[PDB]
Ligand binder design. Structure first.
Ligand SMILES: Nc1ncnc2c1ncn2[C@@H]1O[C@H](COP(=O)(O)CP(=O)(O)OP(=O)(O)O)[C@@H](O)[C@H]1O
Ligand SMILES: [Co+2]
Ligand SMILES: [Co+2]
Ligand code: NA
Length: 356
């Protein structure tokens, strides 16, 4: 029996139900835009469970025994079986508000509120926004427009590996014992991504050394002329706080960057000679490295279901910093992700199996 939880499913990149899940993902995105959180969640859970199937749905009988498939979702599946298209997803793709929100939020630094503001001002194209002489842009949006074409082209694996080399070379210059791990989509086996994410941790660094590393590494890149954008968020981490009851917040020190990646550093099959790459770095205390790795690997749906399962099924509280057992009244320690899954009574799910 297929579990309702993504953390009890193996979800690999060979999606046999892309016709159904692309439509359900569009409908979920539109519900997010229309602030309908409930309908958004129902479409996301249905899309997630179909992504886990080892075969394509070709009839309504194939949906028997599958959880998270309500009446609304089954009507959408029936319509796609009928003529290979979703009339519901097609109407969203042609909606002017949806098209504007997708286009405007494709810019780094533009979220839901700014996209809504520009739409209500009558803007529909990025050309009209960028050339407007009355609009005022944040430093994040200025970088978003300046490096737009590079950032929208996405990052491939030779580029992600080239960025990994740069990150490791910079980090070990200040902390030679530091462990640098590529997380996010690339760790889940994806061929492309919108950014490259890393977890950095050091077994011997002090509290102050841990705090200064991201400042030292970004100053080094700024000196080399590689830092195109930088935003460092200071840590608000509390060693003895209970994990979140909430989409959990990450309190570790982190930075959101845009780096200049020279073409000569990329060893691939194939203009200006460089590409702007979105890079996120997270620094965590050594003892919390397994919780942080698990939270930063994703997918978002896998993380949500992991935390939901921990709370509802095990009376445990899980977040990126810790695992707390409410019955035993103890924090549970882990040196690896495998130990976290064992504490939760879950079969270990490999990172490439977390594409929920
Ligand atoms: N800018 C950011 N802010 C907060 N968390 C982030 C983050 N970037 C990465 N993460 C964390 O690490 C995982 C990957 O996050 P993202 O970079 O936002 C999407 P992704 O799964 O890596 O697809 P992508 O390859 O297109 O970026 C998620 O589990 C998320 O919690
Ligand atoms: Co990412
Ligand atoms: Co990221
Ligand atoms: Na955006």
């Amino acid at each position: 029996k297929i579990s309702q939880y993504a953390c009890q499913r193996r979800t690999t990149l060979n999606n046999y139900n892309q016709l159904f899940t692309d439509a359900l993902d569009i409908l979920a995105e539109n519900d997010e835009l229309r602030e309908n959180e409930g309908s958004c969640l129902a479409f996301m859970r249905a899309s997630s469970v179909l992504k886990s199937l080892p075969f394509p749905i070709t009839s309504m009988k194939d949906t028997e025994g599958i959880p998270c498939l309500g009446d609304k979702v089954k009507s959408i599946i029936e319509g796609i079986i009928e003529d290979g298209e979703s009339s519901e997803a097609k109407a969203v793709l042609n909606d002017e508000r949806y098209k504007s929100f997708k286009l405007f939020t494709s810019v780094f630094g533009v979220g839901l509120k700014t996209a809504e503001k520009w739409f209500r001002m009558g803007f529909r194209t990025l050309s009209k926004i960028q050339s407007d002489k009355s609009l005022r842009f944040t430093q994040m949006q200025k970088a978003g427009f300046l490096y737009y074409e590079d950032l929208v082209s996405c990052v491939n694996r030779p580029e992600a590996e080239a960025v990994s080399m740069l990150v490791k070379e910079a980090v070990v210059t200040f902390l030679p014992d530091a462990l640098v791990t590529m997380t996010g989509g690339f760790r889940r086996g994806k061929m492309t991504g919108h950014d490259v994410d890393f977890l950095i941790t050091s077994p011997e660094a002090t509290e102050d050394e841990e705090q200064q590393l991201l400042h030292k590494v970004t100053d080094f890149w700024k000196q080399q002329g590689l830092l195109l954008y930088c935003d460092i968020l200071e840590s608000t981490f509390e060693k003895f706080k209970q994990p979140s009851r909430k989409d959990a917040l990450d309190h570790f020190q982190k930075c959101f960057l845009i780096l200049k990646l020279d073409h000569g550093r990329v060893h691939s099959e194939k203009g200006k000679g460089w590409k702007a790459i979105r890079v996120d770095l997270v620094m965590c205390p050594y003892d919390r490295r397994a919780f942080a790795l698990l939270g930063w690997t994703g997918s978002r749906q896998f993380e949500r279901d992991l935390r939901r399962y921990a709370t509802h099924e095990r009376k445990m509280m899980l977040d990126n910093h810790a695992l707390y057992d409410r019955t035993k009244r103890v924090f549970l320690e882990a040196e690896s992700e495998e130990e976290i899954f064992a504490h939760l009574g879950l079969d270990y799910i490999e990172p490439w199996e977390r594409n929920a």
